[PDB]
Backbone:
């Protein structure tokens, strides 16, 4: 540097340097697992968005409450329609052998009560056909314990797919590269 | 984007096993005797069987001594050492010229050494922790340090010196190193890409993640002469206090190499070659414009040729019955005293001929990627035969310039005569300077 | 195309020999241009915030570089804080 230059012991902290042209007239602030990185509201929002991603169209678009209740513990009213079920007795008219080969037992009745049971996984949770721990060893038997990242993150461009000349927005904090994308970022993303 | 300067038109002597030459090959035309002798000499050289051979050739300017030297240098390949330097470079300032001649002999002789080395490399995890067993405060001698790399992770602890090397590199947990275990120190690849992007900016390079398994092992083969070892040993390489920085900031000067250092380097190189580390090759020495040397060098070489390690040297004097520079009455052919010529033999490098010179000019046109007409080629060759080939050689390029400015790609008699008018030669200046009132 | 227009009288010197002087002249007569793909970050940096070295994020240093074309903020990687003020300057500097 400029040796023995002008300095009056004004700050000169190597990790503190705050200046501006005074449009706000303020100063600096003072006074590998995702489960230990961020809180739960945003991960819940991401899970809700992913469960919407499960929904394919108008058939499952309003099915989000059922999926949420499953996870947290004429379009969707079950596959029972007479235009589907009661008609199928003639849809196999090519050839079939539909015959009664069965005695009369409670299994035979369960063939029909469970047939159009109007029963879901939610009802399974609300029913005693399976015990309490079965749903736990169905749910918890899948999720991991602590391994959440062992290779780094990518942070791709939100709208385009650029890799260089990247930059974030002032207050939205969303990844982007092209300043052209900023024109719609400050309108629909920020 | 090319530059050819009186050469790059030569690529070899063009011989065979039976000593048969080729009339037009390798940029050489003619000189059957010279090519045969050069082939025999280079065949003797390739065997590494001898040391201190010498030869003098009698060749006038433009006869082809430098061309032969370059061809012979290329015969042995790039790896065989060579150092043909001007005869006026001996008279140095900071070191006595006989010491310089010894230094050049030391440089000329070659060698090939090798070494196998291992190295480890980001950092997976880190667990630091021996006993004083007495009145000492503590004893830290082992720390488990992670080693990510790419193809597998193998963390390992070593001597604590590697740990202080880790602090010396100032590497974080997500920082890649390159630690050659031969010394236990650190060579820094840089930061890592995995624990990177902690900020939008970083002057320090992110550095690509190391590729391959961490326990890297390799072998290196390097051909290094002995004078580099001497100069490396002469000056310090490390240090931390004022002496090291002041010495490195100080400018070293050329000095005199002591013979005890010669004995030491011979001993260590013998020890290393006996282990199979290094293989031996001699050198080749050439000096042009030798007749300007003084009698003291011309008589010291009498005993210097008896050095048992001195490689093959080639001696080149162009003059005739001349006295050695600084001799009152020691007049000899080519300016080399008889007591020195009693240690080597004589070759005769002679000038060229008519078809030979015209083919030389045509080939120079080819290497200069210019088209030459028969009439202009014959005029250039003829006036070279009367006076000098170099005149035509130095007129070729400006004649091509004239042709380009005429928007043509050939030399016509007009271009060569225009260059002749605009550019004279020595002969036309032998009869024009006398009638000059102003000097 | 820089040149070397120097008379041959001053070839003699008390610091460079004749061979060294001639070699220096010859090597100076032939030049090389070098193209380096350097980068930039231009724009009005209206503020330079330097946050503490938090353990989770080693530098939360805000600095709002923005040109006439766009408005943007950036972040310092615990290395460039003194780069701005090697000589004592303020924010808003291109
Ligand atoms: N026999 C030859 N065949 C082809 N080119 C030659 C031959 N002899 C000399 N030359 C060319 O002449 C040019 C000048 O030669 P020069 O080095 O002056 O010879 P000398 O060393 O005998 O003075 C060289 O660039 C070389 O390419
Ligand atoms: Zn984009
Ligand atoms: Zn935004």
Residues:
């Amino acid at each position: 540097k400029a040796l023995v230059e002008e300095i009056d012991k004004k700050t000169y902290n190597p990790d503190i340097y705050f200046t501006s042209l005074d449009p706000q007239a303020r100063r600096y602030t003072s006074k590998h697992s995702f489960e230990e990185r961020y809180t739960q509201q945003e991960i819940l929002q991401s899970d809700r968005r992913f469960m919407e991603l499960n929904t394919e169209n108008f058939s499952d678009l309003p099915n989000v409450p059922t999926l949420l209740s499953d996870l947290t513990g004429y379009g969707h009213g079950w596959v029972l329609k007479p235009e589907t079920l009661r008609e199928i007795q003639l849809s196999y008219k090519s050839t079939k052998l539909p015959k009664p080969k069965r005695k009369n037992t409670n299994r035979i009745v369960a063939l029909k009560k469970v047939l159009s049971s109007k029963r879901n996984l939610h009802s399974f949770l609300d029913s005693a056909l399976l015990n309490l721990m079965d749903k736990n060893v169905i749910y918890h038997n899948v999720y991991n314990k602590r391994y959440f990242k062992v290779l780094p993150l990518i942070t791709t461009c939100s709208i385009c797919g650029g890799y260089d000349s990247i930059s974030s927005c002032v207050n939205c904090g969303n990844k982007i590269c092209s300043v052209s994308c900023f024109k719609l970022h400050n309108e629909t993303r920020c | 984007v090319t530059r050819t300067a009186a050469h790059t038109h030569i690529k070899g002597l063009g011989l065979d096993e039976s000593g048969v030459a080729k009339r037009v090959e390798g940029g050489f035309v003619g000189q059957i005797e010279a090519r045969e002798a050069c082939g025999v000499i280079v065949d003797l050289i390739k065997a590494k069987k001898m040391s201190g051979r010498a030869i003098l050739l009698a060749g006038g300017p433009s006869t082809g001594k430098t061309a032969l030297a370059l061809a012979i240098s290329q015969e042995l390949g790039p790896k065989v050492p060579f150092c043909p330097l001007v005869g006026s470079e001996l008279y140095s300032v900071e070191v006595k010229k006989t010491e310089t001649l010894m230094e050049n002999f030391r440089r000329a002789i070659g060698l090939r050494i090798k070494e196998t080395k291992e190295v480890y490399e980001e950092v997976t995890e880190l667990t630091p922790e021996e006993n004083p067993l007495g009145g000492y405060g503590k004893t830290i001698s082992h720390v488990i340090v992670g080693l990510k790399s790419a193809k597998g992770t193998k963390t390992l602890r070593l001597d604590p010196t590697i740990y202080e090397s880790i602090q010396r590199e100032k590497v974080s947990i997500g920082d890649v190193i390159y630690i050659e275990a031969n010394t236990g120190a650190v060579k820094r690849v840089g930061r890592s890409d995995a624990y990177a992007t902690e900020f939008d900016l970083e002057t320090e390079e992110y550095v690509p993640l190391p590729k391959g398994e961490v326990h890297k092992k390799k072998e290196i083969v390097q051909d290094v002469t002995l004078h580099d070892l001497d100069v490396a040993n002469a000056r310090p390489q490390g240090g931390q206090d004022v002496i090291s920085m002041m010495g490195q900031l100080l400018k070293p000067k050329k000095t005199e190499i002591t013979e005890k250092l010669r004995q030491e380097v011979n001993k260590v190189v013998a020890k290393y070659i006996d282990q199979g580390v290094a293989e031996l090759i001699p050198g080749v020495l050439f000096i042009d414009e030798v007749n300007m040397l003084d009698i003291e060098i011309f008589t010291y070489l009498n005993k210097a040729l008896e050095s048992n390690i001195a490689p093959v040297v080639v001696l080149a004097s162009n003059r005739g019955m001349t006295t050695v520079r600084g001799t009152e009455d020691v007049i000899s052919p080519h300016g080399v005293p008889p007591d020195l010529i009693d240690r080597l033999l004589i070759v005769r490098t002679l000038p060229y001929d008519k078809d030979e010179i015209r083919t030389i000019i045509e080939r120079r046109a080819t290497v200069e990627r210019l088209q030459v007409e028969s009439s202009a080629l014959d005029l250039l060759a003829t006036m070279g035969t009367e006076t000098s080939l170099r005149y035509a050689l130095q007129l070729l390029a400006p004649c091509g310039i004239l042709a380009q400015t005429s928007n043509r790609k050939e030399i016509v008699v007009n271009d060569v005569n225009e260059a002749k008018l605009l550019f004279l030669d020595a002969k036309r200046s032998t009869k024009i300077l006398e009638t000059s009132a102003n000097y | 195309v820089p040149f070397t227009a120097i008379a041959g009288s001053e070839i003699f010197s008390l610091e460079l020999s004749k061979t060294e002087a001639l070699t220096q002249a010859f090597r100076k007569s032939i030049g090389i241009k070098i193209k380096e793909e350097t980068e930039l970050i231009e724009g009005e940096v209206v503020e330079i915030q330097i946050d503490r070295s938090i353990t989770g994020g080693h530098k939360q240093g805000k600095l709002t570089i923005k040109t006439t074309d766009m408005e943007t903020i950036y972040e310092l990687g615990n290395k460039m804080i003194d780069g701005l003020t090697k000589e004592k300057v303020l924010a808003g500097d291109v």
